[PDB]
Every structure is written in C-alpha cells, then in structure tokens.
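Sync notes, pocket subgroup
Present: LS, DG
LS reminded everyone that the earlier model was apo-only. Rerun requested with calcium ion included. Inputs:
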Amino acid sequence: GWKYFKGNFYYFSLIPKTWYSAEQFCVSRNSHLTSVTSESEQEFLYKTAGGLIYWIGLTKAGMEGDWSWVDDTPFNKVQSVRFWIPGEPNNAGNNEHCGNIKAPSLQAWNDAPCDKTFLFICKRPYVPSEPSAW
Ligand SMILES: [Ca+2]
C-alpha cells in the first residue's frame, strides 16, 4: 500500500499511534515519518491526507527546541515558514514538541503533544537493487 511520488514511497497508516510509536513502525519498515522539502511534496501529502490528521517527521532537537526532521534531512527554517498553519507553531500549554499535517492546505502543519495518537505517514527513498559500487 505504498504510494509513489518523485523518487519516494509513502505509507498512509490506517491505525493511529503516538509520534514515536509511529516512527518505530516506520523504522520497522525500513523508513521514517516523512520529511517535506518542497511545495509539490507538501501538496501531494495534504491532498492525499484528504482532511485527516497525520503525524509527520517534525520534532524538536537541540537545547533551543529547533524543529528538525527525524529522517535527518536538514531542516530549512526559511523555506518551511510557508508550510505551517498561521500562528503555528504555538506550543500550546508548553507541551507541543511534535508536528503533524492538519489543515488540507499548503499552510498545513501544526505542533501537538508527542503523546497524542494520530494516523501517520512513513516515507522511503526508492533504492534500486544493484551490485557493489566499489
Ligand atoms: Ca499547535
């Protein structure tokens, strides 16, 4: 049930999990909760989400609480300001350290507490089966 888009496969879960349990599910399937690194990818993801809330690989790292991608893609702060819902991230009750796709729109992301359970989206690069490149 993996959907293909620009060199990556994506898994849209049918069962809700916490942020970390979802990530462990993704890792068990040789993947990670999805990063988002372009306008077209965000569009593909929110359009496919169809108005439902999915955890993505948005989470906090460093002492600052800078946002990051659990798949280790460097987070581009400047290029990602267009992807949050206006007023987000707002850190409601000082306890929101994970991120989901919420609004069916380009401005779509929200921070929520990591312990809430939602559907989730895993992402994995297409890697062709090919011999030793050494
Ligand atoms: Ca929020």
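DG: The chain has one domain: 1-134.
LS: DSSP finds three helices and eight strands in the chain.
Action: DG to write up.
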